[PDB]
């Protein structure tokens, strides 16, 4: 029970969007979860070990494993405890993940597959260096809904302790069944779904060492707690 | 180059003392770092594959294994950068290791080995169920000088987006080559020796979650970061 990860959501929010790991390389490590790429382009869903990808401007692909990531979280998913849920909101179904789970002071992943009666995403506008605090692109990025949609939601809890290394709380990504459309989840409304969770022992943190502008970077994380509830 | 850490010190700062691991748990990811006891009772240091601890009645002894520990950090310890100092005080140490270090957004493993004009360290005194904010334990702490001593002060640099998860930079243990004297260290003047770093690539963090109290605690960190300025 390990979650690997990639680099920090904090040190992304920082502005350092260099992709220092492949596509992969992160799929040596699991065959689920979400992650953007170079730059901080789009959203990257990882589902059954395939890597999807969702930008600006509303196109989705299968990445073909060689694109780079700035940050990333994977895991081998393997459910240790799946129930099911049935016209609820994206709060009441958090609070249900929330009982459900092992612990709240652990982290977690979580995939929600089934039909959706109201999906609603944001798709991270891709940046071009020299780059700037994540925030700003959070700020003019766009953003689709839909409604009774067929697909899975996949992503991670992360304890408040660690609130910045990962995200604060639920950290959720979403692909329909159609391979069409997805990206970070911002609210949803469950039709009928099976809920799927697993506690985890271990996290695995990783660090771009070979990279020279995170070696050299002077960071700073002034406000980026603040800035991370506004941009995610 | 794996940093391996069992348990937060942001944790171990809310209260939660309770042992839930082992000295030979840990001696399987090191031979090189520090920790303390069930109910945080003074200071762990392990040092060339053996586990040392020091508690707040001066006493020195070689762990047997089978103690318990809240919060750990170790290291299987390999030098990336080698080098000598002389007569400087431990701010003036600490600037060059940070000179020295790859990247002060890394985590960082040090070693100092040789004779030092000055050691101040300190024995945490331990606790007794039920546990409360250890930093009533740093405020009544004992603390214990030596002069022109021989010995190895080994820790870790915890880079400023972890705060909290492990400590606010450098986090050092004490112990001379008579095993006879340790602690954490407050303060110290090098006459001659030698540094070792070791540059982190990746941060094994493991959780307690068999730990009931753990599990079900709602872990408070309000002032958590100035808790640990005071008491570290
Ligand atoms: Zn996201
Ligand atoms: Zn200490």
């Given at each position: 029970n390990v979650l690997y990860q990639h680099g920090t959501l904090g040190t992304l929010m920082a502005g350092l969007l260099e992709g220092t790991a492949t596509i992969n390389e992160l799929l040596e490590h699991g065959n689920?979860?979400?992650?953007?790429?170079?730059?901080?382009?789009g959203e990257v869903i990882f589902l059954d070990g395939k890597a999807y990808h969702a930008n600006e401007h509303k196109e989705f692909?299968?990445?073909?494993?060689?694109?780079?990531?700035?940050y990333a979280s994977i895991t081998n998913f393997k459910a240790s405890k799946t129930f099911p849920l049935q016209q609820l909101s994206q709060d009441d179904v958090f609070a249900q993940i929330k009982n459900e789970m092992l612990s709240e002071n652990l982290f977690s992943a979580v995939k929600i597959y089934g039909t959706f009666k109201h999906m609603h995403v944001r798709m991270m506008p891709a940046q071009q260096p020299p780059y700037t605090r994540l925030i700003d692109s959070a700020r003019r990025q766009p953003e689709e809904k839909r409604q009774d949609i067929r697909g899975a939601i996949v992503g991670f809890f992360t304890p408040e302790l660690f609130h910045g290394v990962g995200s604060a709380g639920f950290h959720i990504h979403f692909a329909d069944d159609e391979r069409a459309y997805g990206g970070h989840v911002l609210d949803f409304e469950v039709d009928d779904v099976v809920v799927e969770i697993q506690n985890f022992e271990t996290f695995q943190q990783h660090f771009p060492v070979n990279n020279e502008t995170f070696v050299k970077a002077k960071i700073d994380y002034k406000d980026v707690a603040e800035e991370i509830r506004e941009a995610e």
């Amino acid at each position: 029970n390990v979650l690997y990860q990639h680099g920090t959501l904090g040190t992304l929010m920082a502005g350092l969007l260099e992709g220092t790991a492949t596509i992969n390389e992160l799929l040596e490590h699991g065959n689920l979860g979400i992650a953007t790429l170079t730059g901080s382009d789009g959203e990257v869903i990882f589902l059954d070990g395939k890597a999807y990808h969702a930008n600006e401007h509303k196109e989705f692909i299968e990445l073909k494993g060689d694109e780079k990531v700035p940050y990333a979280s994977i895991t081998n998913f393997k459910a240790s405890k799946t129930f099911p849920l049935q016209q609820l909101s994206q709060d009441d179904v958090f609070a249900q993940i929330k009982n459900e789970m092992l612990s709240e002071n652990l982290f977690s992943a979580v995939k929600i597959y089934g039909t959706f009666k109201h999906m609603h995403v944001r798709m991270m506008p891709a940046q071009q260096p020299p780059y700037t605090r994540l925030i700003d692109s959070a700020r003019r990025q766009p953003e689709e809904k839909r409604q009774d949609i067929r697909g899975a939601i996949v992503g991670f809890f992360t304890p408040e302790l660690f609130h910045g290394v990962g995200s604060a709380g639920f950290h959720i990504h979403f692909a329909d069944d159609e391979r069409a459309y997805g990206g970070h989840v911002l609210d949803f409304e469950v039709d009928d779904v099976v809920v799927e969770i697993q506690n985890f022992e271990t996290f695995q943190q990783h660090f771009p060492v070979n990279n020279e502008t995170f070696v050299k970077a002077k960071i700073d994380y002034k406000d980026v707690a603040e800035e991370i509830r506004e941009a995610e």
